[PDB]
Each structure stands twice: as structure tokens, then as C-alpha cells.
Amino acid sequence: CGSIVPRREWRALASECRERLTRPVRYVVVSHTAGSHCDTPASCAQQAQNVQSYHVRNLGWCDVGYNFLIGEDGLVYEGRGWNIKGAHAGPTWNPISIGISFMGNYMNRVPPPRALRAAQNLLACGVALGALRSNYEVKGHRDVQPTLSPGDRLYEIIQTWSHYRA
Amino acid sequence: CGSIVPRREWRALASECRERLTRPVRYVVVSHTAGSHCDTPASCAQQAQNVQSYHVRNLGWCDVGYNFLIGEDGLVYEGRGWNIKGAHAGPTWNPISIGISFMGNYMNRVPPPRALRAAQNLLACGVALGALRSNYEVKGHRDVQPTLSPGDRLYEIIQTWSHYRA
Numbered sequence A, B: 001c002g003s004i005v006p007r008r009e010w011r012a013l014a015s016e017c018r019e020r021l022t023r024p025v026r027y028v029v030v031s032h033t034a035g036s037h038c039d040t041p042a043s044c045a046q047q048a049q050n051v052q053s054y055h056v057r058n059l060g061w062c063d064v065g066y067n068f069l070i071g072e073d074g075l076v077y078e079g080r081g082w083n084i085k086g087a088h089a090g091p092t093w094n095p096i097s098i099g100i101s102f103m104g105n106y107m108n109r110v111p112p113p114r115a116l117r118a119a120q121n122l123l124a125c126g127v128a129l130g131a132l133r134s135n136y137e138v139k140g141h142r143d144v145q146p147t148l149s150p151g152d153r154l155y156e157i158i159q160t161w162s163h164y165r166a
């Protein structure tokens, strides 16, 4: 639960986000970035920077929209974290969910087991902290918004998860 | 609790080790491999293979001697794990300790924060599982055996840890 790459370590611009989530949060929404893939701590720190740059500079958002990002390096990158409302699943789901995004496009490829392990351990951590309900529900991005996110291959994997609910 | 690269994923030779540790284990001994470092899941899986090869083929040991290895990629590699007696700290400490080894030489270098985080969260996981006592003690390799292990720079860092006792 303490094995998250913190904001400063991936050279994140400072957050301007103020809106808080109400703990414990019932929902996890799993997205993909549909961005470049990365499989080294060096390449994934850069990728998290690029995603945040797009969201802050181009979209004018207070921070990277996701609560956490997942690298194919098997590390979790701190986004808005447990306590700050994300921008990842639209205005109905953002206030009542944690958004975790796998960095890449998983339409025609899977994240490696280390990426999946990182995500599953992140969610266990959320329960332990009281950030997530013990009985949290995992949704695919496409289950709550019109998108291919989180990609067909990754979507089929999260459908098998104990906490998945269509 | 927590995330770990399992034996099969780093292509480990099958273990022949049978001798069990008595849970909960009171002591953690921190070593270095004094070997080549690695900072990618690909390079660290190979490094764990190389360390195990040395221990099994050359030293004739039943498995890699460490209970867990720590990569500069920020991942933990499963060694003998929580339940099997290691070969890392000699015949007095092996039966009463978990041996975790940072892959590299930390005489004139520190492990990156992600490596240190991985190790600290591995130990929290051990407590959560009942593998380690809640009041476990961290020892440097050099505190229980005549060696420079775990290297001057890493030794100075583990001296600052909550559970460290010389």
C-alpha cells in the first residue's frame, strides 16, 4: 500500500484540484490512457508526465484526471490519489469512484501480470486505508461511459476480477 | 498483502528446500548481492536468475539463499519466501530470520527510493500475513556476520528504519 511512485518522483506539475471524494468510495473505474506504452521506471515516469501535460496544459484541468496510473513496469504512479475527485469517468461517476488508468492501448494486447498485480494490490491498500468500501465494485470505463477504454483485452481480464460488477 | 514477482515469472529453477521457518519470525536480515544492479523488470528477472544460478549450481544450495530479492526496478522477487529457511546469514541467524537482498553493490551507491519502498512494504506485508512478528527487528548482514554486506551506503539507510536494532 506504500509502494506507490509519489507525484514528485515522476516530476508531476503541482495539483490545483480541491474537490474531495467522500470516503469510503464504492466504485473503481478501470481505464486505459490509449497513450504510449512503457515497461521501465524511466519510460513510465515520462509517460505519466506526458498524460498529465495533456490534461493540465491542453484540457486546462487542475491535475492529471486519474487517481492512479499503472505502468507495464509494474509500478503504480500517484495521480489525484485517494482523497481528490478525479476527471476520468464523467460527472456522474467522477464524484463516487476511484479512477485507475493502465498506461497504453489494450485493444489488441494485455498488460503484463506485474501491471495487474500492482492494480489489485493498490485496491487492497484502498480498502485497508478506508478509501474504498470493503465491498467496492470494479467497472470498466466502457461500462459507465461510451468509450472502448480500457481496451478489449484488458476489459476481458477485469471482467474475471472478484470485485467486477457489470 | 502486497505485490511480488513469483518464482515462475523470473524463470526460477524449482526449489529443493524443505526446512521451514517457525512463524511468526522475529528477525529480518538485509544483505546486498554485491552483484550487477538492474533497473528494468526484464534486467532484474535475469539478475534474480543469475543469483539463483550461482547459489544452486556453484554453491550447491537447494535454492537461491535469500527469502526475497529487491530490484532497482522497484519490484520484489520471490526467493524461498516467508515459510522456507534461507541461506543468507549463517547457521545461527538463518533458522530465525527472513533474508532480503538488494540486487547490486551499495558500498558507494544507494538503492533508489522505489527499491527502499518495495522492501519496507514487503516487511509490512510479512507482519499482515503473520510471517513476521509485529515487533520484528531489522539487522544489517554485517551486524550478524563478518561482511561489508549490505554495503556502507545501504547500511546507513537501514539504520534509520523504524524496526532497526543493531
Ligand SMILES: CCCCCCC(=O)O
Binding pocket: A001, A002, A125, A128, A129, B001, B002, B121, B124, B125, B128
Ligand atoms: C494503513 C494501512 C497499511 C497496512 C500495512 C500493509 C500494507 O502495506 O498495505
Ligand code: NA
Binding pocket: B165, B166
Ligand atoms: Na542494538
